[PDB]
């Protein structure tokens, strides 16, 4: 139960004809997949662990002005030229200053001078690309066996490494068989269109074009001595003091302005490897060769006693921690539910097969009770431990929460959000295709619109759709406007 | 929740307090209007070399 | 700032967001509105940095 009470888990139930279900695995939150006869198992993506980063260019945030040399030619003559202009280590500017007899020139008028300053730039930003050839992914899979001290245990699991080379893997769960992960890291995230920029000890994921469009001097990354910079005047200001002379002043450390310019970028790790977090990918879970823990186990014949107060998780799933007081150790727990003196059995059981492994280690079970008051029975006779739970809520409220969760997923993920619980359906595929077309056309229009400008554009667009007589586009404009209100109210996660 | 310190499941408060040191700083100086002083040159066209 | 000085409109100087203190040449002062130079980020929902 590595993922119980994680605040973002979302259940996937039902397989396809070939007993496979695909799923998108986001870093924040996991996927607990249950089937009719397969063990319910928690799957959470952990890290992407990129390696062999190549550095494209190095923006540099603070410079140093040295060797300020100048040359002024008399007016009514060619513009001043210095040998340091041709040098690639120097930054120069041409200006016009007033020259008379007191300045040495024979005839009055504006004269041209240049001030070439040798640009040496102290602290720099390295922008590193990751190639899909060496992108990695670590997936931890946990069939939540009824097991002591397993609820919400991040340290317990069976890791499966899925790289674009040999993406399809097979994770050998210790007792329940071998889960298969036939996945595609190619469509997980746009790492071709991203730059990892490492400033001091931190770093971030930023869009490639945004990184290339930054107002900062840049040099091609080749690990060479005394690099030649480009666009140096972005950290050098030349000030003409009343058109008599000019001086060269370096701006300073662009670290704070760079941290403010990074708002909206997702932070990353640098110490101990790249280990990009905040990613996502799509796995197709092949549960063909999974098996339950001894479906043929003899049913337990002695009563169970509680050992921890039953607590309801955020999603309404009960957690019962029981200790078995019998002598026949390997046995399958008898579990049943009631509702209002009627064995409706509307309460489901997430933990597929509650078997007591040792009879000395207390066993914990996660169950999903009905929305009404329900009595849960964990025994066979009158010694049966009876838990009654009242689950506050409504089925309509549950549907609304699920719809909101799905919309939030369709906001974080685009066209690929239709494959979260897909079983390869026909309606689902058509919906994915139409959403692909519409989302491409939409994000093409709103690429770059900010958080508040999206809301403003949406309210303007819905007002326009309310006042347009042609209903064929009035409905379309209102729909688009509401979608954009939602996206503006969801963006900046 | 469970596996994290206590039985009840939900959202728990958390606070991370951190000391602050300024390092570099900048100071705005008001100009004392009494001590403000203007110096103006009066050169006369006398034809000195 | 360091060896450079500027004339700035006083209201604009008071408006610019940066932690500030009385400027009474006291070592280790207390900076009002010091939250502008610290950012607290949640690693999803697990922790605080």
């Amino acid at each position, epitope marked *: 139960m590595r993922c119980v009470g994680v605040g973002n888990r979302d259940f996937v139930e039902g397989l396809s004809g070939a007993t496979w279900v695909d799923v998108v695995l986001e870093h924040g939150g996991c996927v607990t997949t249950m089937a009719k006869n397969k063990p319910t198992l928690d799957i959470e993506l952990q890290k992407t662990e990129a390696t062999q980063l190549a550095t494209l260019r190095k923006l540099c945030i603070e410079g*140093k002005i040295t060797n300020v040399t100048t040359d002024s030619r008399c007016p009514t003559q060619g513009e001043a030229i210095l040998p340091e202009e041709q040098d690639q280590n120097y930054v120069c500017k041409h200006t016009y200053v007033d020259r008379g007899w007191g300045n040495g020139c024979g005839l009055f008028g504006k004269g041209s001078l240049v001030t070439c300053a040798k640009f040496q730039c102290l602290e*720099l930003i390295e922008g590193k690309v990751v190639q899909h050839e060496n992108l990695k992914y670590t997936v931890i899979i946990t069939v939540h066996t009824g097991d002591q001290h397993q609820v919400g245990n991040e340290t317990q699991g069976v890791t499966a490494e899925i790289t674009p080379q040999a993406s399809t893997v097979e994770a050998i769960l210790p007792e329940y068989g071998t889960l298969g992960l036939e996945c595609s890291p190619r469509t997980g995230l746009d790492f071709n269109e991203m730059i990892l920029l490492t400033m001091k000890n931190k770093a971030w994921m930023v869009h490639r074009q945004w990184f290339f469009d930054l107002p900062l001097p840049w040099t091609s990354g080749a690990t060479t001595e005394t690099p030649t910079w480009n666009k140096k005047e972005l950290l050098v200001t030349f000030k003409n003091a009343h058109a008599k002379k000019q001086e060269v002043v370096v701006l300073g450390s662009q670290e704070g302005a760079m941290h403010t310019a990074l708002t909206g970028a997702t932070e990353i790790q640098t110490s101990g490897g790249t280990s990009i977090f905040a990613g996502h990918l799509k796995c197709r879970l092949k549960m063909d060769k999974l098996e339950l823990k001894g479906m043929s186990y003899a049913m337990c014949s002695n009563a169970f006693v509680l050992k921890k107060e039953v607590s309801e998780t955020q999603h309404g799933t009960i957690l019962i921690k029981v200790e078995y007081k019998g002598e026949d150790a390997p046995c399958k727990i008898p579990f049943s539910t009631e509702d209002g003196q009627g064995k409706a059995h509307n309460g489901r059981l997430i933990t597929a097969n509650p078997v007591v492994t040792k009879k000395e280690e207390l066993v914990n079970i996660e169950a999903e009770p009905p929305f009404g008051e329900s009595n849960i029975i964990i025994g066979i006779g009158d010694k049966a431990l009876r838990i009654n739970w009242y689950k506050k809520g409504s089925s309509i409220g549950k549907m609304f929460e699920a719809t909101a969760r799905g919309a939030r997923r369709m906001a974080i993920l685009g066209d690929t959000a239709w494959d979260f619980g897909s079983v390869g359906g026909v309606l689902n595929s058509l919906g994915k295709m139409v959403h692909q077309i519409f989302g491409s056309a939409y994000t093409a229009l709103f690429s770059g619109v900010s958080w508040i400008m999206k809301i403003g554009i949406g309210v303007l667009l819905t007002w326009i759709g309310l006042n347009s007589k042609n209903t064929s586009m009035s409905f379309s404009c209102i729909v688009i406007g509401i979608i954009t209100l939602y996206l503006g109210a969801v963006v900046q996660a | 929740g469970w596996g994290n310190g206590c039985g009840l499941f939900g959202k728990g408060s958390l606070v991370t307090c951190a000391k602050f040191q300024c390092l570099e700083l900048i100071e705005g100086k008001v100009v004392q209007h009494e001590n403000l002083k203007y110096t103006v040159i009066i050169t006369v066209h006398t034809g000195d070399q | 700032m360091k*060896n450079k000085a500027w004339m700035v409109h006083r209201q604009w100087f008071f408006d610019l967001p940066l932690p500030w203190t009385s400027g009474a040449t006291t070592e280790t002062p207390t900076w009002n509105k010091k939250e502008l130079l610290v950012t607290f980020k949640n690693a999803h929902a697990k922790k605080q940095e």
Partner: antibody, heavy 122, light 109 residues
Framework: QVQLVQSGAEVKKPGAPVKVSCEAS????????IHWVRQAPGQGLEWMGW????????NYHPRFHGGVTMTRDTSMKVAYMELKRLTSDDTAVYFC???????????????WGQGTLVTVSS | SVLTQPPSASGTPGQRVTISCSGG????????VNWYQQVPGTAPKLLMY???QRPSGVPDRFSGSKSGTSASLAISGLQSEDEADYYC???????????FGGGTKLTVL
């Protein structure tokens, strides 16, 4: 205990690169500079550049920019330094010193190295 | 601007030693001064780890201060061990580099 120990005394002829090294141990290397000071025989002390091993940025003295290069190599906690084309004039002893990151600690140096003396003669 | 200091000396009885560095308006006037002791043949030692602040030992025989564009190291009486080469170092901002003094051979006489 924190200390800096050099590579050891070296001698080379004019027009030959030399790579003076400086070992660092006992503290967090990435949190302090290496100020690589120079001192000619019986002459005034002369600072010539520091590097930030947390990032690798180098602040050479204007005189020594281009003539010298400094590398952090934070894996082994060893702040290397190289001289591109060693001349007869540049005979001295090259200390490596530890300085603080902030402005008040730019010019304060504690735990200097012994200094690798480099003699240049034909 | 380059900060300067002259070589000085004093007798073994510690009357007073006045060893002064006069820098520009960008190096000394806005940055803390740092004093260094160098016994010949040895690596320099950080005599002052800040303006008018001592890291360890030798109290009241080494005590400095800066007023405006100049800095100095005062005394309440010298000893025989106080014979070394002294350096004042400040981080210039216009030149954006660490400036070291020209040197001074203080000899116990």
């Amino acid at each position: 205990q924190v200390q800096l120990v050099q590579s050891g005394a070296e001698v080379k002829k004019p027009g030959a690169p030399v790579k003076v090294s400086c070992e660092a141990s006992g503290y967090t290397f990435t949190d302090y500079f290496i100020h690589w000071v120079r001192q000619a025989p019986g002459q005034g002390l002369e600072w010539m550049g520091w590097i930030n091993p947390i990032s690798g940025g180098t602040n050479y003295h204007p005189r020594f920019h281009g003539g010298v290069t400094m590398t952090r190599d934070t894996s082994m906690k060893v702040a290397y330094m190289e001289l591109k084309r060693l001349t007869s004039d540049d005979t001295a002893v090259y200390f490596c010193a530890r300085g603080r990151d902030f402005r008040g600690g730019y010019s304060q140096l504690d735990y200097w190295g012994q200094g690798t003396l480099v003699t240049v003669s034909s | 601007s380059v900060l300067t200091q002259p070589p000085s000396a004093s007798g073994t009885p510690g009357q007073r030693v006045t060893i002064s560095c006069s820098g520009g308006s960008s190096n000394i006037a806005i940055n803390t001064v740092n004093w260094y002791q160098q016994v010949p043949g040895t690596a320099p030692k950080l005599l002052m780890y800040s303006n008018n602040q001592r890291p360890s030992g030798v109290p009241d025989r080494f005590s400095g201060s800066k007023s405006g564009t100049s800095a100095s190291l005062a005394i309440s009486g010298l000893q025989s061990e106080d014979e070394a080469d002294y350096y004042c170092a400040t981080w210039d901002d216009s030149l954006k580099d660490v400036l070291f003094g020209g040197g001074t051979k203080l000899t116990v006489l």
